[PDB]
Amino acid sequence: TLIKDPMVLNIMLFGSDERPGETGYGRSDTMMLLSIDNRNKKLKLTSFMRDTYVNVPEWGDTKLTHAYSYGGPALAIETIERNFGIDIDRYAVVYFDTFPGIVDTLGGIEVEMTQTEADVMNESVGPEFANFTEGKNTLNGATALVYVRIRYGVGDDFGRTQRQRDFMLQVLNKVKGTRDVGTLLTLLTKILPGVTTNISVNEMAGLAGGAISSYMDYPMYQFRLPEDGAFSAVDVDAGNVLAIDDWDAAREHLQRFIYEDTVDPIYGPSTETYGSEM
């Protein structure tokens, strides 16, 4: 029933600034499918919004993020599969406290934002670390962590959701270009302390092999559900959610973006392309 290509490897990535509280699973606002598309030699990063109104197994209709709260990675995965119809292979949770290590090892990450970034940013760090402008500011590990947590009131909530999403795409893109072995090794070193994953050590080796020999040469595309036209922000019992008016289309678009021509038998050939090359 689920769309599954041997040549396309789906590893879900969770960005979490809340490790398991030791009853429970903590929390993850960010969800990002990595699709290693060996068929079309491409890397694809599909984001799913925190507040997407979805059907969680045994919990009915609710915010997508609640799946993780209630059941951790495993339930969130199952919710994605049931609502979107694709088969997730593996998953990895990466904690925000792992980030400083990552950034420094990469030698900075470049982001951008209005003169409001610089304010909240420059008046957050030391007056002598305050070095933020309007265009391209480079963050170090230290500032990165500040960057992804900063919230300018409750209206800037989505702005944080998106600062965190863009930050993550950056890191991934920058890791993607990175060719130096020592850097890569060290990057792994920065990650292990803050990673939970069902990927076996052996599978991790194969993937590091794949990445060096092939994967990092693939061009990389990103895509997001729900799409920009395709939802409303309705207030329900579960709170303020993002209702997708056309689920059949959400699925068609996602499954096309990842599997492309392989789903021609389900939806017929299309001339549409989804996502954007990074």
Q: What is the DSSP letter of 140?
A: P
What does the alpha-carbon distance between residue 261 and residue 50 come to, in Å, rounded to a whole number? 29
Nearest one of 37, 65, 96 to 219, comparing CA atoms: 37
Q: What phi, psi does 18 have (nearest 5°)?
A: -155, 95
| Residues ≥6 apart with Cβ < 8 Å to 261 | 269
* CA-based torsion, 39, 9, 68, 62: positive or negative: positive
Nearest one of 13, 190, 191 to 88, comparing CA atoms: 13
CA angle 13, 148, 94 (to 5 degrees): 25
Instruction: Collapse the DSSP code of 92 into the 3-class scheme (helix H, G, I; strand E, B; otherwise coil) and give the result.
Output: strand
What does the alpha-carbon distance between residue 101 and residue 145 come to, in Å, rounded to a whole number? 10
What does the alpha-carbon distance between residue 252 and residue 64 come to, in Å, rounded to a whole number? 19
Q: How many angstroms is the resolution?
A: 2.4
Q: What is the identity of the amino acid at 66? A: H
3-state SS of 215-253? Answer: HHHCCEEEEEECCCCCEEEEEECCEEEEEECCHHHHHHH
Pairing outcome for strands 90-95 and 136-139: unpaired
Pairing outcome for strands 109-112 and 90-95: unpaired
Domains and CATH numbers, the chain: 1-277 (3.40.630.190)
| Residues ≥6 apart with Cβ < 8 Å to 73 | 12, 14, 25, 91, 93, 196, 198
Pairing outcome for strands 30-37 and 42-48: antiparallel
| Residues ≥6 apart with Cβ < 8 Å to 256 | 263, 267, 270, 272, 274
Tell the residue number behind the tokens 């492309």, with chain if given. Answer: 260
One DSSP character per residue, 174-221 reads HHHH---HHHHHHHHHHHGGGEEE---HHHHHHHHHHHHHTGGGS-EE
Experimental method: X-ray
Nearest one of 241, 193, 187 to 211, comparing CA atoms: 187
* CA-based torsion, 61, 67, 71, 77: positive or negative: positive
Output the six-digit token pair for 25. 């699973």
Question: Are the C-beta atoms of residues 97 and 21 closer than 8 Å to each other?
Answer: no
Give the residues across from 16 on adjacent strands.
95
Residue 200 region, left (φ>0) first, then alpha (ψ -120 to 50), else beta?
Answer: beta
What does the alpha-carbon distance between residue 190 and residue 210 come to, in Å, rounded to a whole number? 21
What does the alpha-carbon distance between residue 173 and residue 220 come to, in Å, rounded to a whole number? 8
What does the alpha-carbon distance between residue 221 and residue 113 come to, in Å, rounded to a whole number? 22
Q: How many residues does the chain have?
A: 278
Between the alpha carbon of residue 241 and those of residues 11, 99, 127, the distances in Å are 26, 29, 39
Tell the residue number behind the tokens 């957050």, with chain if given. Answer: 124
Give the residues across from 139 on adjacent strands.
109
